Amino acid sequence: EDFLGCLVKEIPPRLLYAKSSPAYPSVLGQTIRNSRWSSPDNVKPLYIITPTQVSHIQSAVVCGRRHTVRIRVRSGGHDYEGLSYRSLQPETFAVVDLNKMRAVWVDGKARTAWVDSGAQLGELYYAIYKASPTLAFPAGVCPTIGVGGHFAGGGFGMLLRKYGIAAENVIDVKLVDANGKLHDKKSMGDDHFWAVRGGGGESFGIVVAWQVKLLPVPPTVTIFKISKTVSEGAVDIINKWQVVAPQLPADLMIRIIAQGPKATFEAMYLGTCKTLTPLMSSKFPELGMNPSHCNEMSWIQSIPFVHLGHRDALEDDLLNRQNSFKPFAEYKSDYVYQPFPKTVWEQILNTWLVKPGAGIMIFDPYGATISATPESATPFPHRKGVLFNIQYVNYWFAPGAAAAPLSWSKDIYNYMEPYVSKNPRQAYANYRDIDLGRNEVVNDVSTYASGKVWGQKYFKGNFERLAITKGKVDPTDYFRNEQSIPPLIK
Ligand SMILES: *Cc1cc2c(nc3c(=O)[nH]c(=O)nc-3n2C[C@H](O)[C@H](O)[C@H](O)COP(=O)(O)OP(=O)(O)OC[C@H]2O[C@@H](n3cnc4c(N)ncnc43)[C@H](O)[C@@H]2O)c(*)c1C
Ligand code: NA
């Protein structure tokens, strides 16, 4: 009651929602991307606040501290476990939902932009395009991802071999800390500014907006999507790909999608068919690429084409807040440093992907720019030596049909253990997986030991520095969730 009274004093009441408010269910649901987490059995926030100004965010945080009510911040809602809007066990929290803070101001000549955290990637990309057809920003593939959680967790996509992760192309931030104080790079200092860019969402404060550098792309890029069934030699071809792809020139990224005994090789090339064709013949002739496979288009057009296969609907695909796609979904990830034996590829394609509840596997090759950054230079540690990332994705569409896919996800993770990274078994923070471990809270503070279990998987050798930084900027563990960085204090 007191917390709400505090809010009402400082924030316009139309931006405040209690469980009894008529619009609360729609506001809560508007960016829930996973039908597992929308149902009434999920733990719901006591209040939702939808700020439109940074002062609203500061007021909310100050009220939360004064009245000891914690806040989960939501930008795009894509968190794989829903931790921006639900808790795992009953507890009291408010959501600060940034969807109304969505401006993207592009300075084409300076090659910089300020992007509000509540913008979706498609809106960021589109605003860049409105400024220039030859500038880009290296972030994720799905247009509805929110900037805030994505950049906080790193963020990577079809430009990762060329320009690395989104967070290493951030040049400043505007951030509200656990005391309600407004910060930028300068006031924050090296440790906090290091941590916020890739050290995972929530833990390091609410980022209001991010300043990014914008990077050149050619006026024409080329996409291909070439599929090979096992009868067409998919096993031999993917066995070659895992060595070749991470060594290809930085201008060429060939990811793979597999969902049965067939692999689809999806390439983005920063160039034309005319130069791609001989490059493929020289470096990866096994795929059988020829000019009929080329799809030349602008960089901006590549975003809907890669994710959706659409050629013809730029604005509709990039400016989309309908939230129409809400699978029940489970996700896991792995990193690979040593090539799989051919027999493992045989089993993945012919056996694991033909089981009940089997998902899809996405393979993204590293090397080049992403792998050139030292492991400790940012919190994202999956760099030198990485051949590829694997994402294991399970979608289903009926409420009572979770058993088979959930079982498959666990079973394949067990099967893959000998072949992927170990000690620790690395995973990508933005492919959030609660089964990697969760925090224990003692005396109202997440324990260091519990955080380390999953934390070393996402952040490797960077976990301790993250936790020491957390201890400096949020010693009472105000901004937390079940898998946020615990404070390590003296
Ligand atoms: C749904 C979805 C996710 C994808 C997709 N493809 C991806 C890709 O091509 N590359 C990637 O690198 N990642 C991809 N992912 C995963 C997303 O990157 C993650 O799911 C992001 O974390 C999502 O960000 P957002 O949509 O903002 O999600 P939220 O649930 O709001 O937040 C996640 C996490 O971060 C905290 N947080 C939110 N907002 C902030 C701010 N402003 N400051 C600090 N922390 C913040 C939340 O509390 C939560 O913990 C493709 C698809 C379809
Ligand atoms: Na290891």
Ligand code: NA
């Ligand atoms: Na999960």
